[PDB]
Amino acid sequence: ANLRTQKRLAASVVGVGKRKVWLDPNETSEIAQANSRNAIRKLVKNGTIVKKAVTVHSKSRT
Amino acid sequence: SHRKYEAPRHGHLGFLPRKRAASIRARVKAFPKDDRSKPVALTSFLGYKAGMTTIVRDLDRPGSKFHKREVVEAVTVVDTPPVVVVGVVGYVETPRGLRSLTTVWAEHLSDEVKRRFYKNWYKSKKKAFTKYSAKYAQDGAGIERELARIKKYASVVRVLVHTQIRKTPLAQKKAHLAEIQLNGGSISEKVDWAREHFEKTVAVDSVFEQNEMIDAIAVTKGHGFEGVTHRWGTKKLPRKTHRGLRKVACIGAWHPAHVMWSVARAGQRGYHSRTSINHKIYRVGKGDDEANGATSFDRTKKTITPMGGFVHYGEIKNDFIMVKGCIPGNRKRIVTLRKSLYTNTSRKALEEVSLKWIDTASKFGKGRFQTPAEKHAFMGTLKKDL
Amino acid sequence: DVVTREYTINLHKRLHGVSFKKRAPRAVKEIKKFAKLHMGTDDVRLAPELNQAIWKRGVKGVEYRLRLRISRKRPLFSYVEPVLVASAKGLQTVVVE
Amino acid sequence: ARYGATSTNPAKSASARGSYLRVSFKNTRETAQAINGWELTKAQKYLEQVLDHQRAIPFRRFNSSIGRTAQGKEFGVTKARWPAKSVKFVQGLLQNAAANAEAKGLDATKLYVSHIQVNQAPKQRRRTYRAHGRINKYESSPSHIELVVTEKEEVRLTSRQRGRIAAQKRIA
RNA sequence: GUGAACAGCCUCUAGUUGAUAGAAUAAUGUAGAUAAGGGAAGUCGGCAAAAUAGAUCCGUAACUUCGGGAUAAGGAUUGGC
RNA sequence: CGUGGAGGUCAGUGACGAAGCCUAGACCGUAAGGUCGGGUCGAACGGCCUCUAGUGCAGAUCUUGGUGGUAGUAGCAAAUAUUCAAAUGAGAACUUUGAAGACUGAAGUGGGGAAAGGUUCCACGUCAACAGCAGUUGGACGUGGGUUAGUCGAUCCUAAGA
RNA sequence: GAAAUUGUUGAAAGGGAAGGGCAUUUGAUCAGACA
Ligand SMILES: [Cl-]
Ligand SMILES: [Cl-]
Ligand SMILES: [Cl-]
Ligand SMILES: [Cl-]
Ligand SMILES: [Mg+2]
Ligand SMILES: [Mg+2]
Ligand SMILES: [Mg+2]
Ligand SMILES: [Mg+2]
Ligand SMILES: [Mg+2]
Ligand SMILES: [Mg+2]
Ligand SMILES: [Mg+2]
Ligand SMILES: [Mg+2]
Ligand SMILES: [Mg+2]
Ligand SMILES: [Mg+2]
Ligand SMILES: [Mg+2]
Ligand SMILES: [Mg+2]
Ligand SMILES: [Mg+2]
Ligand SMILES: [Mg+2]
Ligand SMILES: [Mg+2]
Ligand SMILES: [Mg+2]
Ligand SMILES: [Mg+2]
Ligand SMILES: [Mg+2]
Ligand SMILES: [Mg+2]
Ligand SMILES: [Mg+2]
Ligand SMILES: [Mg+2]
Ligand SMILES: [Mg+2]
Ligand SMILES: [Mg+2]
Ligand SMILES: [Mg+2]
Ligand SMILES: [Mg+2]
Ligand SMILES: [Mg+2]
Ligand SMILES: [Mg+2]
Ligand SMILES: [Mg+2]
Ligand SMILES: [Mg+2]
Ligand SMILES: [Mg+2]
Ligand SMILES: [Mg+2]
Ligand SMILES: [Mg+2]
């Protein structure tokens, strides 16, 4: 499959960069069927697509 | 026009071509002239180079500043297990040169020699010399006829010997076979000596003795393809030189319109046959003798092997020859030791050498202890031993 | 046969003098050749967990020794997994039941 | 389709060919000569070993300034290579010829490569850019391949001369 | 964040992970480097390279259009707690 | 001697094979050339007497087109760097997803525009050619979809000037 | 469907070019007269 368009839509819908988008490798069948922004919102809701946490830049030593 | 300034030529033209040797065992191209009023003896011996170390001795040379004073010298150690006589070969003089007439082999040969005749020993049926041994099954009439032919016609007698490679730390398992000319006695005496030594061993102390000048024949260390700067020693070109500076700038004049053979060129360096003469023997060592590395001054009990063993070689467990200076070839390489071709009386020969101390410190670093006992006395007890 | 064994591989001597940008990729190929020598299988598969252990300290920070578990499975192939131990020293080849 | 010159019996043979194949003509010619005259099954196993770099294809004509290997000693040469792309094209045609032989009714045990020939196809052209704003050609050399597999099969005398012959007969 | 700093060096957000590859480590190269003792003897010529380098304190000549020369030259100090 | 075309003639040759082409096959002529057999081929062509010319090539760093040796050779080395597994497929070092290791380090390899380009934007299908390796991918190929203003610009004003 | 150039098959020759002239040997091949 080619999920390039789904990752681009997921980043726009969630509001983060493409580097923070996680697509479930075990659910590529249902992800490939999601071509609209409404379908992406449903996948985010049920945990198929999640938002990864930001990389920590601690200021303890500072 | 003539060259602006005169300089001697780079390199020796008598050591051409600088190609790889045909075999790893360098050929012996000249034996000592035979004196037949002497007992039959070998003229050369086979050994393996193990490494180098250092000795201290008192100099005996009147008129020298260091007369009756200690000097520090470098020596080379050659592992020399006994060789095994397994045949003889006779030669006949001919207007076209020496020609081999007959070869007679011993009745039994070990697996060391037989491996030399095979390239795929693990798959072979090991049929070598099986039918030849049947010539001994009868009363030896076949062997007697061939030996009689050598006595009747031969003018030069040589013996086939092989090393006992299994006694060395090497992993080769395949022995080296070579011809050694017999000097002394008549042709019949040479053949009788060779026949009686079939399947026997000859020790190095029966060939060489203390304070004797010998020649070393071996193939030098290889270095692959080399540029002119290090291969021939030409001057490096200035830093400004375009197209590189490790070169010869002019390789010939306009005429003759060819590159001459005497111009330095890039090519193979090392792995050449060499014959270096006048190497005095400092010690003939015995393998079964404890305190091989001991002198009449040191008195301690220690072998010739340094602490940790010779680097890349191992331990010395057989007879060895200690020779002053350096020898062509690298460690673990088969070398041939030959008796002198002339009588030397330069007062550097015939002088008695008495070793006072032999260095057995580790050659794997800045070794500082001669023996393990000395190390224990200095450092004391460590955490590991308590 | 189907057999599982635990091995210690000395990567220090297998990466001696290797270019820094190639040391971690070279260790991957060294492990594949190591498994082929002991199991005789031309097909070697490395778990992604093992890949993280090799690349743990960058492209040029490969550990001197690694403790490996190699399994030969049904014609045959080898599967290499990491073994979680405090230190990789002092361990010899053992057979896993 | 008309093939090249052949001397085999068509009733006992099968043929295969391919045209305008985008594979090096020079590399394919060397590969074809390596199996010319071989048994079909022996040739097929040999081509598989080439892809595994166990045996090599000897290069005899188009071999200037190439490397040398120890795997050429089988054929008494020093220069040999492993042209994988040309080998796969030959393997496909060997498979097709064997399929055609089976359809006719020829047993594969006695089949051998009786004819194989590589011809030069029209070139395909691209451009390459050189220093100082120049343009040179950058072309491929395609090949035509054809092959055939076949079953193996196992007084005037003068009066003086007449008199001499007659005389000898009455002697003994 | 370091620091005088839009310098160099490391990181967060975001963005890429693209430039034909595999194996080996000869000569000669291109690029980056280090050298015992001597110290320009090299060379048309110190070309190239090396040495010097921040900050604080001390000290600073001839000459001068009195503004300079001047960071002249020449010395000392510098971490952590 | 040979070539294109013209007048006359042989009531000339020919789809039962004209012309052309191939032929270390045969014959004639000192030679320019002429004739025959075999193969290939498919629609026109020749001998002789005369007329006529854009009438004969090895060259001109000749013109146009085609093709070699060089040669599977020079080379495909700037911009720090890739690795494991799964999915897809006839086929995966290069496509997608996940994991890991890295870089740009805010005068960026980030986020918008003025010129200039003109559909390169987006989806589906899809790999012959193109992406100087590869390719299931693409700014490629095929078929369609997409740019919404009383307030943003143009439009209005004048500048050097026309 | 010519030539340059190329593949396969068949024949022949080849000790730092190849090609040519006169003469004959060997191999291959071929017309003419059997009045
Ligand atoms: Cl000389
Ligand atoms: Cl051009
Ligand atoms: Cl170099
Ligand atoms: Cl004529
Ligand atoms: Mg030699
Ligand atoms: Mg220059
Ligand atoms: Mg040492
Ligand atoms: Mg050449
Ligand atoms: Mg080359
Ligand atoms: Mg270019
Ligand atoms: Mg240009
Ligand atoms: Mg600051
Ligand atoms: Mg120096
Ligand atoms: Mg110094
Ligand atoms: Mg000077
Ligand atoms: Mg000078
Ligand atoms: Mg300078
Ligand atoms: Mg016709
Ligand atoms: Mg012809
Ligand atoms: Mg028609
Ligand atoms: Mg004209
Ligand atoms: Mg012409
Ligand atoms: Mg002319
Ligand atoms: Mg021209
Ligand atoms: Mg190259
Ligand atoms: Mg190349
Ligand atoms: Mg280049
Ligand atoms: Mg790069
Ligand atoms: Mg940087
Ligand atoms: Mg960085
Ligand atoms: Mg697009
Ligand atoms: Mg390409
Ligand atoms: Mg392609
Ligand atoms: Mg299109
Ligand atoms: Mg046609
Ligand atoms: Mg032609």
Curated annotation (Swiss-Prot), chain A:
This is Large ribosomal subunit protein eL19A. There is a cross-link at residues 20, 52, 59 (Glycyl lysine isopeptide (Lys-Gly) (interchain with G-Cter in ubiquitin)). Present with 97700 molecules/cell in log phase SD medium. Component of the large ribosomal subunit (LSU). Mature yeast ribosomes consist of a small (40S) and a large (60S) subunit. The 40S small subunit contains 1 molecule of ribosomal RNA (18S rRNA) and 33 different proteins (encoded by 57 genes). The large 60S subunit contains 3 rRNA molecules (25S, 5.8S and 5S rRNA) and 46 different proteins (encoded by 81 genes). eL19 lies in close proximity to the binding site for eukaryotic initiation factor eIF4G. The gene is RPL19A. It is found in: Cytoplasm. Component of the ribosome, a large ribonucleoprotein complex responsible for the synthesis of proteins in the cell. The small ribosomal subunit (SSU) binds messenger RNAs (mRNAs) and translates the encoded message by selecting cognate aminoacyl-transfer RNA (tRNA) molecules. The large subunit (LSU) contains the ribosomal catalytic site termed the peptidyl transferase center (PTC), which catalyzes the formation of peptide bonds, thereby polymerizing the amino acids delivered by tRNAs into a polypeptide chain. The lineage of its organism: Eukaryota, Fungi, Dikarya, Ascomycota, Saccharomycotina. The modification Phosphoserine is found at residues 29, 36. Belongs to the eukaryotic ribosomal protein eL19 family. Transmembrane segments: none annotated. The chain holds residues 2 to 63 of 189 of the full protein.
Swiss-Prot record, chain B:
The gene is RPL3. It is found in: Cytoplasm. GO terms for biological process: cytoplasmic translation; maintenance of translational fidelity; ribosomal large subunit assembly; rRNA processing; translation; translational elongation. There is a cross-link at residues 38, 135 (Glycyl lysine isopeptide (Lys-Gly) (interchain with G-Cter in ubiquitin)). Component of the ribosome, a large ribonucleoprotein complex responsible for the synthesis of proteins in the cell. The small ribosomal subunit (SSU) binds messenger RNAs (mRNAs) and translates the encoded message by selecting cognate aminoacyl-transfer RNA (tRNA) molecules. The large subunit (LSU) contains the ribosomal catalytic site termed the peptidyl transferase center (PTC), which catalyzes the formation of peptide bonds, thereby polymerizing the amino acids delivered by tRNAs into a polypeptide chain. Transmembrane segments: none annotated. The modification Pros-methylhistidine is found at residue 242. GO terms for molecular function: RNA binding; structural constituent of ribosome. InterPro entries: L3_arc_euk (IPR045077), Ribosomal_L3_dom_3_arc_sf (IPR044892), Ribosomal_uL3 (IPR000597), Ribosomal_uL3_CS (IPR019926), Transl_B-barrel_sf (IPR009000). Pfam families: Ribosomal_L3 (PF00297). GO terms for cellular component: cytoplasm; cytosol; cytosolic large ribosomal subunit. This is Large ribosomal subunit protein uL3. Keywords: Cytoplasm, Isopeptide bond, Methylation, Phosphoprotein, Ribonucleoprotein, Ribosomal protein, Ubl conjugation. Disruption phenotype: A mutant confers resistance to trichodermin, a trichotecene toxin produced by plant-pathogenic fungi. It comes from the Eukaryota. The modification Phosphoserine is found at residues 23, 155, 296. PROSITE patterns: RIBOSOMAL_L3. The modification Phosphothreonine is found at residue 102. Disulfide bonds: none annotated.
Curated annotation (Swiss-Prot), chain C:
The gene is RPL31A. This is Large ribosomal subunit protein eL31A. There are 2 genes for eL31 in yeast. It comes from Saccharomyces cerevisiae (strain ATCC 204508 / S288c) (Baker's yeast). Component of the ribosome, a large ribonucleoprotein complex responsible for the synthesis of proteins in the cell. The small ribosomal subunit (SSU) binds messenger RNAs (mRNAs) and translates the encoded message by selecting cognate aminoacyl-transfer RNA (tRNA) molecules. The large subunit (LSU) contains the ribosomal catalytic site termed the peptidyl transferase center (PTC), which catalyzes the formation of peptide bonds, thereby polymerizing the amino acids delivered by tRNAs into a polypeptide chain. InterPro entries: Ribosomal_eL31, Ribosomal_eL31_CS, Ribosomal_eL31_dom_sf. Keywords: Cytoplasm, Ribonucleoprotein, Ribosomal protein. Belongs to the eukaryotic ribosomal protein eL31 family. One of its GO terms (biological process) is regulation of translational fidelity. Its main location: cytoplasm.
From Swiss-Prot, chain D:
GO terms for cellular component: cytoplasm; cytosol; cytosolic large ribosomal subunit; preribosome, large subunit precursor. The modification Phosphothreonine is found at residue 69. It is found in: Cytoplasm. There is a cross-link at residue 45 (Glycyl lysine isopeptide (Lys-Gly) (interchain with G-Cter in ubiquitin)). Coiled coil: none annotated. GO terms for biological process: cleavage in ITS2 between 5.8S rRNA and LSU-rRNA of tricistronic rRNA transcript (SSU-rRNA, 5.8S rRNA, LSU-rRNA); cytoplasmic translation. Keywords: Cytoplasm, Isopeptide bond, Phosphoprotein, Ribonucleoprotein, Ribosomal protein, Ubl conjugation. The keyword Ubl conjugation applies. One of its GO terms (molecular function) is structural constituent of ribosome. InterPro entries: Ribosomal_uL22, Ribosomal_uL22_CS, Ribosomal_uL22_euk/arc, Ribosomal_uL22_sf. Pfam families: Ribosomal_L22 (PF00237). It comes from the Eukaryota. The keyword Phosphoprotein applies. Belongs to the universal ribosomal protein uL22 family. There are 2 genes for uL22 in yeast. Component of the large ribosomal subunit (LSU). Mature yeast ribosomes consist of a small (40S) and a large (60S) subunit. The 40S small subunit contains 1 molecule of ribosomal RNA (18S rRNA) and 33 different proteins (encoded by 57 genes). The large 60S subunit contains 3 rRNA molecules (25S, 5.8S and 5S rRNA) and 46 different proteins (encoded by 81 genes). uL22 is associated with the polypeptide exit tunnel. This is Large ribosomal subunit protein uL22A. The lineage of its organism: Eukaryota, Fungi, Dikarya, Ascomycota, Saccharomycotina. The gene is RPL17A.
